[PDB]
């Protein structure tokens, strides 16, 4: 069972996150982690805070801690994959993100991140496949059409690129009134 000290520290780190400042919160998340060792939740939370601070490399190594405790932690992989992609470590992000999508096969955003990771790794064809899936799962999103258009310009398929761009145009008009 969760100890009183741990409840207190959780309680405070929530005030600190919701009141803006995750540098303070981070100190209380570590206190919580100290009292409830082998609870993945405070570690997972530190990972989030570190990512928001911009300490991305440090965030990854904390998300690995939570993934050692809970190998299938679906959200820990999601966020790890997302920062790995921001750091431009594409090869490493691919297996992480591919696991996210095998757990949440209708998550358009997972597939979008996956597409960007493949594209970064110069696997254009695989990235199109993934970004296409994002577009099928959420056809009103401008961003996914936009990328899928550019991927197709590089593939020299200007017809389907133009389709996606003329769609980006359409969404922009109809998201005023
Ligand atoms: Cl792109």
């Amino acid at each position: 069972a969760m100890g009183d000290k741990a409840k207190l520290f959780r309680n405070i780190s929530q005030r600190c996150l919701r009141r803006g400042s995750p540098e303070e919160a981070l100190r209380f998340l570590k206190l919580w982690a100290r009292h409830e060792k082998n609870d993945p939740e405070p570690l997972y939370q530190m990972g989030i805070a570190l990512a928001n601070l911009g300490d991305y490399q440090r965030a990854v190594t904390v998300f690995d801690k939570v993934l050692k405790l809970r190998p299938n932690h679906f959200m820990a992989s999601y966020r790890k994959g997302a920062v790995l992609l921001k750091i431009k470590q594409y090869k490493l992000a691919l297996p992480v993100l591919e696991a996210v999508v095998a757990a949440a096969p209708a998550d358009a955003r997972a597939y979008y991140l996956l597409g960007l990771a493949y594209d970064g790794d110069e696997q254009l064809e695989k990235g199109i496949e993934a970004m296409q899936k994002a577009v099928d799962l959420d056809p009103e999103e401008i961003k996914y059409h936009q990328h899928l258009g550019f991927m197709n310009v590089r593939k020299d398929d200007h017809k389907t690129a133009a389709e996606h761009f003329t769609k980006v145009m359409e969404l922009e008009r109809s998201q005023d009134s």
Side-chain angles (χ1 to χ4, degrees):
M2 192 183 246
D4 289 348
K5 289 196 182 289
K7 286 194 237 268
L8 176 54
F9 298 139
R10 174 178 66 183
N11 214 133
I12 292 171
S13 33
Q14 289 174 351
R15 298 290 171 145
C16 293
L17 272 149
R18 196 174 60 252
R19 204 209 38 258
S21 65
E23 192 81 51
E24 291 167 57
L26 186 44
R27 299 181 71 191
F28 289 104
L29 295 179
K30 291 176 190 169
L31 272 283
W32 173 11
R34 275 164 50 190
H35 284 75
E36 304 293 311
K37 66 192 240 290
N38 306 327
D39 187 348
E41 187 54 15
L43 294 164
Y44 171 73
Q45 283 303 319
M46 288 165 52
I48 307 198
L50 290 170
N52 297 341
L53 280 29
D55 300 316
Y56 297 120
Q57 196 45 83
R58 298 191 47 205
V60 171
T61 48
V62 174
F63 290 131
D64 285 337
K65 248 152 137 102
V66 32
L67 288 162
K68 293 286 143 180
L69 282 56
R70 295 291 189 285
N72 305 316
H73 198 309
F74 153 80
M75 287 302 290
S77 302
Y78 206 139
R79 294 176 185 282
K80 185 182 161 196
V83 328
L84 282 180
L85 183 58
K86 209 198 223 271
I87 295 168
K88 317 182 187 289
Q89 285 172 54
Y90 307 116
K91 282 197 195 296
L92 206 346
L94 285 175
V96 176
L97 289 171
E98 273 274 5
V100 171
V101 212
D107 193 318
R109 191 184 148 72
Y111 276 111
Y112 151 87
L113 296 181
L114 183 62
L116 294 177
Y118 279 126
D119 192 49
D121 195 50
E122 293 202 58
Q123 299 193 66
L124 187 62
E125 314 65 14
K126 288 286 289 200
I128 285 172
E129 189 188 321
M131 195 61 70
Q132 185 60 76
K133 185 61 171 203
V135 166
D136 295 331
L137 289 162
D138 187 3
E140 301 308 299
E141 186 53 67
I142 324 88
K143 203 190 333 147
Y144 306 157
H145 279 82
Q146 211 160 215
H147 286 295
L148 214 180
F150 286 117
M151 287 176 197
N152 276 296
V153 306
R154 271 179 287 173
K155 205 184 70 172
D156 277 306
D157 192 328
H158 295 267
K159 310 288 60 152
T160 51
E163 285 172 28
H164 287 117
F165 292 139
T166 54
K167 186 68 190 237
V168 181
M169 233 14 272
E170 286 167 1
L171 284 322
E172 291 277 338
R173 297 197 187 86
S174 76
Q175 296 175 20
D176 304 335
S177 92

